[PDB]
């Protein structure tokens, strides 16, 4: 029926409704740090999130998204391997049922507890919908989460999850600053890929940060209290909403550092 992460509608079933699932540039992938090519041509990333305007937090049934006002160049990303300006539209997470799994991308086969995705669309295309239909339409900044000390900047998000426990629920979420989710270093790996959830369009330039951010066990625990289901239905905890690594095929992963 509808896609999900369960035994009967999980990742291995997606190809039936979205044949692109078996395409040539699917994500996520395993980052082999020894074969990734350091490219001196890559420019530093430029993240300008000082004017970011968050609007709402929503449980869409597969994750929770924090949405931003993308009607103007308020929070943008440029530089790196990108040509042009990409606007931040939303960020969301993928996490596991246990601390040893949860991330989508892996580094030398190592899985992290969760993975943060900051989705941006190329302004040259006018709107998000047109952007996803282009090979260079989106830029997604991926950040790994490891369990350790608390991330102060993440607490506001954690505190509101109670109000959006089930599918379809949303709440006002203004004045949230995404800069508090960033690691200290901006070194990264990049390769051409796709969305990791249906429609799995191959329109993404992935920018995966080398440095993980630390979150406490109590923080990740609250992610695990969310529900895939809507209110009034049998409770199915939202955990392990991650897609396994896909084959790299004819792609090269480039690193911005040596």
- Catalytic residues, by residue number, are 62
Question: In this chain, which stretch among 29-37, 111-119, 150-158, 169-177 interacts with Zn ion, using CB under 5 A?
Answer: 111-119
Residue nearest to Zn ion according to CB distances in the complex: 117
Does 94 carry a binding-site annotation? yes
Distances (CA, A) of 109 to 97, 104, 117, 135, 257: 18, 11, 19, 27, 20
Question: In this chain, which stretch among 30-38, 109-117, 148-156, 178-186 interacts with Zn ion, using CB under 5 A?
Answer: 109-117
Task: Name which of 103 and 227 has its Cβ closer to Zn ion.
Answer: 103
Query: Residue 233: which residues within 8 A CB-CB, separation 6 or more?
Result: 166
Q: Please say whether the beta carbons of 15 and 22 come within 8 A.
A: yes
Distances (CA, A) of 122 to 100, 183, 204: 34, 24, 10
Does 117 carry a binding-site annotation? yes
Q: How far is the CB of 258 from Zn ion (least distance, A)?
A: 29
Asked if 167 touches Zn ion (CB under 5 A), the answer is: no
Phi, psi of 118 (to 5 degrees): -100, 105
Of the candidates 76, 109, 77, 106, which has an alpha carbon nearest to the alpha carbon of residue 94? Answer: 106
Question: In this chain, which stretch among 67-75, 117-125, 126-134, 184-192 interacts with Zn ion, using CB under 5 A?
Answer: 117-125
Does 106 carry a binding-site annotation? no
Task: Name which of 87 and 117 has its Cβ closer to Zn ion.
Answer: 117
Binding marks (x or -) toward Zn ion, 66..105, rule CB under 5 A? ----------------------------------------
Q: How far is the CB of 64 from Zn ion (least distance, A)?
A: 11
Asked if 62 touches Zn ion (CB under 5 A), the answer is: no
Task: Name which of 2 and 34 has its Cβ closer to Zn ion.
Answer: 2
Q: Please say whether the beta carbons of 69 and 55 come within 8 A.
A: yes
- In which element (H, E) is residue 46 found? strand 45-48
As a 3-state breakdown, the chain gives helix, strand, coil percent values, each rounded to 5, of: 15, 30, 55
Q: How far is the CB of 87 from Zn ion (least distance, A)?
A: 17
Q: Please say whether the beta carbons of 137 and 128 come within 8 A.
A: no
Question: Helix (H, G, I), strand (E, B), or coil: what is residue 119?
Answer: strand
Binding footprint of Zn ion, residue count (CB under 5 A): 1
What is d(CA 196, CA 106) in angstroms, rounded to the nearest whole number?
Answer: 14
Question: In this chain, which stretch among 33-41, 113-121, 186-194, 236-244 interacts with Zn ion, using CB under 5 A?
Answer: 113-121
Q: How far is the CB of 196 from Zn ion (least distance, A)?
A: 5
What is d(CA 85, CA 94) in angstroms, rounded to the nearest whole number?
Answer: 26
Task: Name which of 115 and 136 has its Cβ closer to Zn ion.
Answer: 115
Rg (C-alpha) for the chain, rounded Å, is 17
Asked if 117 touches Zn ion (CB under 5 A), the answer is: yes
Task: Name which of 54 and 197 has its Cβ closer to Zn ion.
Answer: 197
Does 2 carry a binding-site annotation? no
Footprint of Zn ion on this chain (CB under 5 A)? 117
């Amino acid at each position: 029926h509808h896609w999900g992460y369960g035994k009967h509608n999980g990742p291995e079933h997606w190809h039936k409704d979205f044949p692109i699932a078996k395409g040539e540039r699917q994500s996520p992938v395993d980052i082999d740090t020894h074969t990734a090519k350091y490219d001196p041509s890559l420019k530093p990333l430029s993240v300008s999130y000082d004017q970011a305007t968050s609007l709402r937090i929503l449980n869409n049934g597969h994750s929770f998204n924090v949405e931003f006002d993308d009607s103007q160049d308020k929070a943008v990303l440029k530089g790196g391997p990108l040509d042009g300006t990409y606007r931040l539209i939303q960020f969301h997470f993928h996490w596991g049922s246990l601390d040893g799994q949860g991330s989508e991308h892996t580094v030398d086969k190592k899985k992290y507890a969760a993975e943060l995705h900051l989705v941006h669309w190329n302004t040259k295309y006018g709107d998000f919908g047109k952007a996803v239909q282009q090979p260079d339409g989106l830029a997604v900044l991926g950040i790994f989460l490891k369990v350790g000390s608390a991330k102060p900047g993440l607490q506001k998000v954690v505190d509101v999850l109670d109000s959006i426990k089930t599918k379809g629920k949303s709440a006002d979420f203004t004045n949230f600053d995404p800069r508090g989710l960033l690691p200290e270093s901006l070194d990264y790996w990049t390769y051409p890929g796709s969305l990791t959830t249906p429609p799995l369009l191959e329109c993404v330039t992935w920018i995966v940060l080398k440095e993980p951010i630390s979150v406490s066990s109590e923080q990740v625990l609250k992610f695990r209290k969310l529900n895939f289901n809507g209110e009034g239905e049998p409770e199915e905890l939202m955990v392990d909403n991650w897609r396994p690594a896909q084959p790299l095929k004819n792609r090269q992963i480039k690193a911005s550092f040596k």
